[PDB]
Amino acid sequence: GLTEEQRMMIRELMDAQMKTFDTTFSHFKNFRLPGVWSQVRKDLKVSLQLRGEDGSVWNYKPPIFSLLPHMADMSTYMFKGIISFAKVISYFRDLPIEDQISLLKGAAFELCQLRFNTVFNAETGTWECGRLSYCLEDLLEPMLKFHYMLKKLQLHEEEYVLMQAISLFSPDRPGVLQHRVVDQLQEQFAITLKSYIECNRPQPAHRFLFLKIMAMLTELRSINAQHTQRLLRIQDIHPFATPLMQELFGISLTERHKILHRLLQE
Numbered sequence: 142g143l144t145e146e147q148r149m150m151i152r153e154l155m156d157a158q159m160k161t162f163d164t165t166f167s168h169f170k171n172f173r174l175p176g177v178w179s180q181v182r183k184d185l186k187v188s189l190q191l192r193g194e195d196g197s198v199w200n201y202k203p204p205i206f207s208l209l210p211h212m213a214d215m216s217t218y219m220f221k222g223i224i225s226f227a228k229v230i231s232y233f234r235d236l237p238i239e240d241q242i243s244l245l246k247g248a249a250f251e252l253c254q255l256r257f258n259t260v261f262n263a264e265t266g267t268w269e270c271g272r273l274s275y276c277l278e279d280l281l282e283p284m285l286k287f288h289y290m291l292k293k294l295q296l297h298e299e300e301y302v303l304m305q306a307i308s309l310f311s312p313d314r315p316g317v318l319q320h321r322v323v324d325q326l327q328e329q330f331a332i333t334l335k336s337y338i339e340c341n342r343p344q345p346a347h348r349f350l351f352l353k354i355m356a357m358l359t360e361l362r363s364i365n366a367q368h369t370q371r372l373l374r375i376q377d378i379h380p381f382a383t384p385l386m387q388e389l390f391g392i393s394l395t396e397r398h399k400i401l402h403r404l405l406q407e
């Protein structure tokens with residue numbers, strides 16, 4: 142029941158996701174591990190499990206700043222995959238390089254959380270990242286509530302990838318010049334998601350699924366703002382961000398974002 146243009150739009154997004162989402166984290170290598178002012182303290186509860194290909198397990202039970210290098214490496218690895226995702230998309234590729242930088246700076250965290258939700262096991266409170274597992278030791282925390290609520294919707298791969306496109310093509314991110322072009326693209330991804338749900342879901346039980354997804358995207362944008370401000374405060378008193386994170390989080394747009402500009406021309 143989708144139009145031919147809507148099916149091609151989904152095909153292109155699914156192609157891009159398959160090529161750029163390392164779901165088994167088998168290429169996440171050479172990362173740092175935890176070794177063997179007042180607001181930044183409040184700004185900072187999981188165990189890390191590293192399964193060896195031989196059976197052996199290394200587990201890290203936490204006691205603050207000792208997890209930051211590892212998190213910076215995982216985030217940077219995820220952000221590289223999200224930049225590669227946006228590059229594969231023709232609608233993104235045809236935008237001016239400055240608007241490409243602006244959209245990625247605005248959506249990097251949101252797209253990373255959407256991809257992390259696909260590996261989140263809500264029954265065990267664990268993000269299953271291939272041989273790495275981040276297990277909640279223990280709904281009040283907005284980011285946790287978001288992962289539990291999104292997982293509960295039991296979305297298809299197509300719905301997650303349309304959520305990524307809707308979040309990526311946000312016309313109101315700081316620095317966006319082609320507001321009307323990006324707004325038209327976002328509207329067509331949202332209409333495509335709405336049509337996909339009408340055509341593929343048994344009508345009554347999924348009657349408001351599209352609205353629930355759009356509400357989750359609104360909540361995600363709000364959490365993104367809280368995360369960015371928390372990160373800048375931590376970075377200000379204890380530097381940890383990698384050069385790519387510094388560019389994405391704001392720590393002549395092509396001159397200020399040379400790593401991003403290089404990654405986009407590759």
Ligand SMILES: Cc1nc2cc(-c3ccccc3)nn2c(-c2cc(F)c3c(c2C)CCCO3)c1[C@H](OC(C)(C)C)C(=O)O
Pocket residue numbers: 186187188189201203208211212213215216257268270275284285
């Ligand atoms: C609040 C917060 N506390 C902590 C704490 C530890 C941590 C990591 C290793 C050992 C001990 C503690 N990790 N960790 C993370 C964290 C970070 C990541 F990169 C990441 C993952 C998570 C859990 C899971 C998938 C792999 O990637 C977060 C936040 O994660 C969410 C937004 C909630 C997802 C965040 O992004 O700050």
